[PDB]
Structure 1
């Protein structure tokens, strides 16, 4: 039942995998490989020190559950999950396997100029799995071009969980590309929205059009200025940001910025597209368009079909509000790796 494994050291780390995964090849933690069982290129992720603390433990279970759960054409699926371990007691390492696509937004945009019809199809596809993720009450907090895989037939898959949270979860502060990232995150709001992801799409989508990075900061205040240079300084409602009363006075100290007309910035863009961005790049997350409503936006006329824009299933997030020791999280997790059912 248990395949022969084999350990080999890749870049200061050990990697014990079953022998159906050949030619492990680091990308950055991830290797690329070739799966003999099926003959597809895959990506293996070894989780970094799971079960190191009560919070990593929790972190690991959560990720795994989510991946097990995602079953949508525009969201990546778990091909395999495994561990070298032969029982719960030696159990300490976790590997996830997924399909390697061929390309991603990151690199197709460095080298091809995308026409509008391209953009439509791609953004709609992104939006369409966001509608799927957000139905499970999940904010994937790391939308960005390299986490958006595309393949030859131009299908799109959203890629990276781990930073994903359930919505009413006290938000924590984290490591990632600041370019695609909502203001409210950058101000460390303890609570925040699924519309944070809409901000990203907004940014990702303007990059497709123009060829360039919308807001290419170099640190947070540079990031925050670049943003204001476009959407303009906000009104007094602003009291809202108590979350950071040291950040509040640093915005009120900032020079006063007029809101730019998007149609004067995005020359040659479809007016429908520019309209849609104007509804994505508002600093007030209350007035920011949802994935669902955005799917209804006329820009997507050509592709919009509700009945193939499905919602996700009944789940138990129950655990989110549990306090267990490491060893509890450990077992819960182990069981899930055992109970894994692999797609055909």
Structure 2
């Protein structure tokens, strides 16, 4: 067991191993508080996240377990991984606090799309890395559910990592109105049309790739219905085959109230783009999720010919998510989480 020391950073007690030095507040959502630190064992600058109220409800206890299972599993160059997890507790009986440690990320994709000039070669390399990461995540039957520019870390060498997986957090108010939180969402999840699956993440990649090519948001809706009208004007209104797959009768009645529109010419929308980029956007931005290109298929598209290496696009180890259908008490979720903290083995 390492030696721990205590300090107060902005009205919060931090109790951490001596290896972590020079802690400074970086931010705080409703999920926890984050400090930057120097890790003397590895020589990396790190982010240390102290969870808030991890075991306050069954919902919160299961979310804590879900987050630690997911971060312990992810071992890929284009996905955030876990450097360390610790608790100052010496037994299950006094266990209350969970701390997660990752590499400190500088810039997100928003800090390069808004203020930097991008060549086609930059767009090829950035979208290639998102898809390489997604091939890995989807091979474990994990859905990210919240891909958007603020959830993609990028360095000076244009190297990219996916972070901030959807742990089923987002609220109704968070998705309301003129908000980036909704602009990258597939229409079937935005309006609860049907049981969604991993295809929702490829819709989000289409929206991100369009914005790297034009420097503008693709579907900046002022509300859910405004956003749907922007989407259907580009890709066309649904045919009979998709309408059959929408489970809400009321959602089917609403779609049938709209005037029919054909799919637009994407070469006239993405003026001057590489024809191969236009072709790949037509294959991602398909209304029927069954007919969208997959991550594995997209990596073999001619747009990525300069970067594609089928011997360096790995898949994940199998991931058991059977806990998701399990009904447990707060103290049972807390015991499972405690076991996952004490069994953690750091990377080389």
| TM-score, length-scaled by structure 1 | 0.90
Q: 1:232, 1:260 within 8 Å by CA — same for their partners in 2? A: yes
Query: How far off is 1:93 after superposition?
Result: 2.0
The whole-number CA distance in structure 2 between the counterparts of 1:177 and 1:335 is 34
For the aligned residues, what is the CA RMSD?
A: 3.8
Residues 306-326 of structure 1: CA distance to partner in whole angstroms, max 9, x if unpaired? Answer: 111111113333323322212
Compared CA separation, residues 290 and 263, structure 1 to 2 (3 A)? same
Q: Report the number of matched residues.
A: 343
Partner SS for 1:32: strand
Of the structure 1 ranges 323-332 and 19-28, higher mean CA displacement relative to structure 2 is found in 19-28
Matched-pair contact (CA < 8 Å) for 2:107–2:155: yes
TM alignment of 1:238-257, pairs within 5 A: 238-240=242-244, 242-257=246-261
Shift in Å, 1:26: 3.8
Instruction: Tell me by how many angstroms 1:190 deviates.
Output: 5.5
Q: Quick one: structure 1 residues 12 and 102, their matched pair in 2 at CA, closer, same or farther if it must change by over 3 Å?
A: same
Cα distance, 1:138 vs structure 2:
0.5
Q: For the structure 1 residues 72 and 275, does the alpha-carbon distance in structure 2 shift closer, same or farther, using more than 3 Å as the test?
A: same
108-117 or 150-159, larger mean C-alpha shift:
150-159
CA deviations on 1:75-109 (whole Å, 9 max, x unpaired) are 11101111222221221221211102332212111
Note the C-alpha offset of 1:175. 11
Aligned pair partner of 2:36 in 23, 32, 53: 32
Residue pair 2:178, 2:220 contacting (<8 A) in 1 also: no
Do the aligned partners of 2:179 and 2:222 also contact (CA within 8 Å) in 1?
no
Using a 3 Å threshold, how does the CA distance of structure 1 residues 221 and 195 change in structure 2: closer, same or farther?
same
**Shift, 1:66, TM fit:** 1.5
> What SS is found at the alignment partner of 2:210?
helix
Taking a change above 3 Å as real, the CA distance of residues 260 and 171 of structure 1, as seen in their structure-2 partners, is closer
**8 Å CA contact retained: 2:55, 2:61:** yes
Task: Please list the CA deviations of residues 96-126 of structure 1 after superposition, one character each: whole Å capped at 9, or x if unmatched.
Answer: 1110233221211111121100111111111
**Which segment is superposed worse, 7-16 or 106-115?**
7-16
Q: Offset of 1:53 from its aligned partner?
A: 2.2
Cα separation, 1, equivalents of 2:57 and 2:147: 27
The 1:131–1:173 alpha-carbon spacing in structure 2 relative to 1, beyond 3 Å, is: farther
| Closer/same/farther in 2, CA of residues 162 and 267 from structure 1, 3 Å limit | closer
The more displaced of 102-111 and 171-180 is 171-180
Secondary structure of residue in 2 paired with 1:128: helix
**Aligned mate of 2:340, from 329, 336, 339:** 336
Shift in Å at residue 192 of structure 1? Answer: 1.2
Q: Which stretch of the first structure deviates more once superposed, 12-21 or 96-105?
A: 12-21
Q: How does 1:191-340 map to 2 (within 5 A)?
A: 191-240=195-244, 242-340=246-344
After superposing the two structures, state which structure 1 stretch, 83-92 or 258-267, moved more.
83-92
Instruction: Report which stretch shifted further, 148-157 or 243-252.
Output: 243-252
Partner of 1:316, secondary structure, is coil
Give the stretch that moved more between structures: 259-268 or 216-225: 216-225
CA pair 223-168 structure 1, distance change in 2 beyond 3 A: closer
Supply the distance in 1 between the matched residues of 2:120 and 2:291 (Cα, whole angstroms): 26
- Partners of 1:169 and 1:341 lie apart in 2 by 39
Larger displacement relative to structure 2 (158-167 or 334-343): 158-167
Which whole-Å CA distance do the structure 2 matches of 1:153 and 1:105 have between them? 13
2-side partners of 1:205 and 1:332: how far apart? 40
Instruction: Give the stretch that moved more between structures: 181-190 or 259-268.
Output: 181-190
Cα distance change of structure 1 residues 319 and 38 upon mapping to structure 2, 3 Å threshold: same
TM-score of the two chains, using structure 2 as the length reference: 0.89
Distance in 1 separating the partners of 2:306 and 2:13:
49
